[PDB]
Design a protein around this ligand. Structure first.
Ligand SMILES: COc1ccc(NC(=O)CN)cc1
Length: 164
């Protein structure tokens, strides 16, 4: 009944070298229960590697943490990412000739703030080619999208992947 642990983790980059397991935990526990929280360190010197990870009890807690960005942890703005090809644009395929901008917008706007929707048309005829690109203002939207098993838009079962 628990979501897979991999989907509950956040890799936190750009840490202050002074951040510890304890201070990273105290920060990120504001958005959920942490089942794990570790700062990566050198095995010999114990000096921070500048990144670490936190594991929440649920995916909704991961979402809450991501929605609370930017995170300033021990004085430094850090870079959380879900468990990286960091892009803001998706390819959406399988939408056929009847899918319009509003179909894509109404669905994808619940993943993130949309900046561009490009419904692809044939260079020669202008007919729709059956695929589109959606650009968001931030990569987490795409990360949430591509881990779903299924996307249904305008009644079509769509293929969605990271784009460039
Ligand atoms: C920034 O854009 C969005 C960010 C988060 C959500 N929803 C959730 O996080 C729901 N748990 C939707 C849009």
């Amino acid at each position: 009944p628990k979501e897979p642990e991999q989907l509950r983790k956040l890799f936190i980059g750009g840490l202050s070298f002074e951040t510890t397991d304890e201070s990273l935990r105290s920060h990120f526990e504001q958005w959920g229960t942490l089942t794990d929280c570790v700062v990566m360190r050198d095995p010999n010197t114990k000096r921070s590697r500048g990144f670490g990870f936190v594991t929440y009890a649920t995916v909704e807690e991961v979402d809450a943490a991501m929605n609370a960005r930017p995170h300033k942890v021990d004085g430094r703005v850090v870079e959380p990412k879900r468990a990286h090809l960091t892009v803001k644009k998706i390819f959406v395929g399988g939408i056929k000739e009847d899918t319009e901008e509003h179909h894509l917008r109404d669905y994808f706007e619940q993943y993130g703030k949309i900046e561009v929707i490009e419904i692809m048309t044939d260079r020669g005829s202008g007919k729709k080619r059956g695929f589109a690109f959606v650009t968001f203002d931030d990569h987490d939207s795409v990360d949430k999208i591509v881990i779903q098993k299924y996307h249904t838009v305008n009644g079509h079962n769509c293929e969605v992947r990271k784009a460039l």
